[PDB]
Every structure is written in structure tokens, then in C-alpha cells.
Amino acid sequence: GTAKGHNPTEFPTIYDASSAPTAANTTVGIITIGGVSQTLQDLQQFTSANGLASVNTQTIQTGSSNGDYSDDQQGQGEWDLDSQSIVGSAGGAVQQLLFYMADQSASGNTGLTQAFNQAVSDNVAKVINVSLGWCEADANADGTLQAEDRIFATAAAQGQTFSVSSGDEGVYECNNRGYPDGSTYSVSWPASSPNVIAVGGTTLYTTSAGAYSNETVWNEGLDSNGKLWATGGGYSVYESKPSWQSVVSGTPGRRLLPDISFDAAQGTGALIYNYGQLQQIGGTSLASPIFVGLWARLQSANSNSLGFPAASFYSAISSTPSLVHDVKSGNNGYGGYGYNAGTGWDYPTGWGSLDIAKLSAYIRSNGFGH
Ligand SMILES: [Ca+2]
Ligand SMILES: [Cl-]
Incomplete structure (x- = not known):
């Protein structure tokens, strides 16, 4: 196995989804901050370059009609990562891709809150990607956490799956977003919500023929500014x-995260068109859209009838280890600190990555979600 970048259209063979239906019959949402005008051009470049049918898109202003929905330039690369990775992992088709755009001039943190709220109120997208996060203690301090958890609770109850990146700062989410802080560990919101699927990050190795080879923890160490780049994971303090x-014994009475993980290392990341230029990009911002596309195709295969799947993942994977690639090697800290991967569920990676063929067979036999 070796480390290299990957076209999004490769994620179905990597994660054994290529024999499954595509997501052609499932609508998918993406939460953004601001507009997506360049992202939509980049998406066209993506589908056209890959010879795929064009994607039906819609953009939704979720806040004031007088709000600021201008493009955030750096943001376009995130919405690019999300949209291209979803469509590739979905098998090259989604019913529609909805961009729920947060108002950039909204009061306090309410821009993003209103975007979550519109996706839930509309209840058109079955699966929604959130490649955004921040220190859960900061979200809690001004009441954002409480307000947004109510929204995600409504989503889960009505059968929508929010997928949220676990974080890119390893265990150091609340230390200025990623500076090593020794033994002080923290987690990201909204990944820490029990009403969303939290998706962590791996280093993905494939064979020369493109077969899945192995995954380790995503941890690429410090950048030039001294910030750690690694998969978020741990437990909520709230x-x-x-x-x-409860099946993960020996853990605190708190929401443990992530649930599952997919490719996140930049060194093994996705090739994404961003302002017209192909770039190799990682993060748990990649891992979550991989999951969203795979989950959307499982929904299509099941007439969009699968409920919020967290409880089903835990019961199925704990009893059926063949459903996942269990990550065993690596850590999500620095300097000897952080959590270590190991057998079964662990704090860097949760259960690991899904084998979609085996999960699809399991669902055909047993159903899924509640
Ligand atoms: Ca493990
Ligand atoms: Cl329960």
C-alpha cells in the first residue's frame, strides 16, 4: 500500500461501494458559510472533466434576505471539497445538491444556526454535510450549543442524517484551534452532538492497483505556524x-466521538478543483463528505427509508466487525500526548471506516436506523 492523492470518483472502489446503487434518488445538503458561486463553477469543471452527468443544484439563503451571501474565497475550497467528494463517493449522481448558505452578516453565531435550522425545517435533504466546527466550550458559553442541539434533535427524529467533521486539531480543538496543549484535550461542536454522525480521519493507503490496503490515524503533525493537523476525537464535556x-465499555458518561472515520490525510487526500485549479486536499472536512456520499447511496438503495443511524452503527459494528476497517495504529495528539488507536472503537477514529458492500448486505438482511 502507498500514500497518494485520489480522484473523488475513486472513493467508491476504495470503500467497496461500487456495486451498490448510486445516490441518484437521494437529495443531499451542504451547509456553507456564505455563497457558492465559484464552487458551482468548480463543480461543473468536476463533473465535466470526469464525464459525469451534470448535478442538479440549488442554493438557499437561510438568513435575512438582506444578508451577506457573497463568496468567501477560502470557503469555496471547502464547499468544493464537500460537493466533489459527495458526488464522487455517491457514485457520480445525487438527486439534487442543496447548498444551505449561512448569512455572513448575521448577529453573533446565528448565521450558521439559521442554516442548520433551514435544512431541518425544509426536510428535503436526507443527508446533510457539515465540514465546520469549533470548540464545544465556546459554543456552549454563548448558548449556541443548546440552540443548535435542539435543531439536530429535530433532524434525527425526522430521519435526517447530519454528518459532521470531527475536527482538524486532534485533541487540541479548544487551544486556539490546534496548538499543542500537553494533556489538555477537547472536542469540536457540532460533532459532539449525539444527534449527528461525527466523522473522523484516517491516513489511507492503497495498492498500485487501487485496492484498499490499510488506514492509520490521520496525524500529519505541526504546520509551519505550529498548529497540529490531526483527527478530532475524544468525548464531550457536556x-x-x-x-x-454503552457498548464501548470503559469510557465516561459522555458522548464519545467520532462515530466512524474516512480518508483525511492531505498526503492521501482528494484531488479537488478549486478556483479552476486541481489541488490535493484533506481534513476531516474530506472524511465527512465521503461518508455523506456513501450514506446517501445506501439511502437510495433503501428508498430513503433509513432513519438516523447512530444506534444501528453501534449495535451492528460491535457485533459484526467485518462491517468496518478497524484502524489500529496512530494517535491524535503531539509529543506523546493524545489518544491512541487500538482494537475496536477508539477515540481518534471511532469504529473506523465502513466497508459499504458488507454494510449493504447487512442492511438488506436486517434493516437499519430508527
Ligand atoms: Ca480501532
Ligand atoms: Cl436511546
Whole structure:
């Protein structure tokens, strides 16, 4: 196995989804901050270059009609990562891609809150990507956490799956977003919500023939500014443990995250068109859209009838280890600190990555979600 970048259209063979239906019958949302005008040009470049049918898109202003929905330039690369990775992982088709755009001039943190709220109120997208996060203690301090958890709770109850990147700062989410802080560990919001699927990050190795080879923890160390780049994982200090996580014994009475993980290392990342230029990009901002595309295709295969799947993942994977690639090697800290991967569920990677063929067979036999 070796480390290299990957076209998004490769993610179905990597994660054993290529024999499954595509997401042609499922609508997918993406939460953005601001507009997506360049992103939509980049998406056209992507589908056209890959010879795929064009994607039906819609953009939704989720705040004031007088709000600021201008493009955030750096943001376009994130919405590019999300949209191209979703469509590739989905098998090259989604029913529609909805961009739920946060108002950049909204008061306090309410821009993003209103974007989550519109996706849930509309209840048109079955699966929604959130490649955004921040220190959960900061979200809690001004009441954002409480307000947004109510929204995600409504989403889960009505059968929508929010997928949220676990973070890119390893265990050091609340230390100025990623500077090593020794033994002080923290987690990201909204990944820490029990009402979303939290998606962590791996280093993906493939064979020369493109077969899955192995995954380790995503941890690419410090950048030139001294910031750690690694998969978020740990437990919430606020959120109680949901019933289904009781199967992970020896953990606190808190929401443990991530649930599952996919490719995140930049060194093994996705090739993404950004302002017209192909770039190799990682993060748990990649891992979450991979999951969203795979999950959307499982929804299509099941007439969009799968409910919020967290409890089903925990019962199925704990009893059926063949459903996942169990990550065993690496850590999500620095300097000897952080959590270590190991057998079964771990704090850097949760259960690991899904084998979609085996998961699809399991669902055909047993159903999924609640
Ligand atoms: Ca593991
Ligand atoms: Cl429960």
C-alpha cells in the first residue's frame, strides 16, 4: 500500500461501494458559510472533466434576505471539497445538491444556526454535510450549543442524517484551534452532538492497483505556524452518553466521538478543483463528505427509508466487525500526548471506516436506523 492523492470518483472502489446503487434518488445538503458561486463553477469543471452527468443544484439563503451571501474565497475550497467528494463517493449522481448558505452578516453565531435550522425545517435533504466546527466550550458559553442541539434533535427524529467533521486539531480543538496543549484535550461542536454522525480521519493507503490496503490515524503533525493537523476525537464535556454507546465499555458518561472515520490525510487526500485549479486536499472536512456520499447511496438503495443511524452503527459494528476497517495504529495528539488507536472503537477514529458492500448486505438482511 502507498500514500497518494485520489480522484473523488475513486472513493467508491476504495470503500467497496461500487456495486451498490448510486445516490441518484437521494437529495443531499451542504451547509456553507456564505455563497457558492465559484464552487458551482468548480463543480461543473468536476463533473465535466470526469464525464459525469451534470448535478442538479440549488442554493438557499437561510438568513435575512438582506444578508451577506457573497463568496468567501477560502470557503469555496471547502464547499468544493464537500460537493466533489459527495458526488464522487455517491457514485457520480445525487438527486439534487442543496447548498444551505449561512448569512455572513448575521448577529453573533446565528448565521450558521439559521442554516442548520433551514435544512431541518425544509426536510428535503436526507443527508446533510457539515465540514465546520469549533470548540464545544465556546459554543456552549454563548448558548449556541443548546440552540443548535435542539435543531439536530429535530433532524434525527425526522430521519435526517447530519454528518459532521470531527475536527482538524486532534485533541487540541479548544487551544486556539490546534496548538499543542500537553494533556489538555477537547472536542469540536457540532460533532459532539449525539444527534449527528461525527466523522473522523484516517491516513489511507492503497495498492498500485487501487485496492484498499490499510488506514492509520490521520496525524500529519505541526504546520509551519505550529498548529497540529490531526483527527478530532475524544468525548464531550457536556453531552451525556447516548444509550447505544454503552457498548464501548470503559469510557465516561459522555458522548464519545467520532462515530466512524474516512480518508483525511492531505498526503492521501482528494484531488479537488478549486478556483479552476486541481489541488490535493484533506481534513476531516474530506472524511465527512465521503461518508455523506456513501450514506446517501445506501439511502437510495433503501428508498430513503433509513432513519438516523447512530444506534444501528453501534449495535451492528460491535457485533459484526467485518462491517468496518478497524484502524489500529496512530494517535491524535503531539509529543506523546493524545489518544491512541487500538482494537475496536477508539477515540481518534471511532469504529473506523465502513466497508459499504458488507454494510449493504447487512442492511438488506436486517434493516437499519430508527
Ligand atoms: Ca480501532
Ligand atoms: Cl436511546
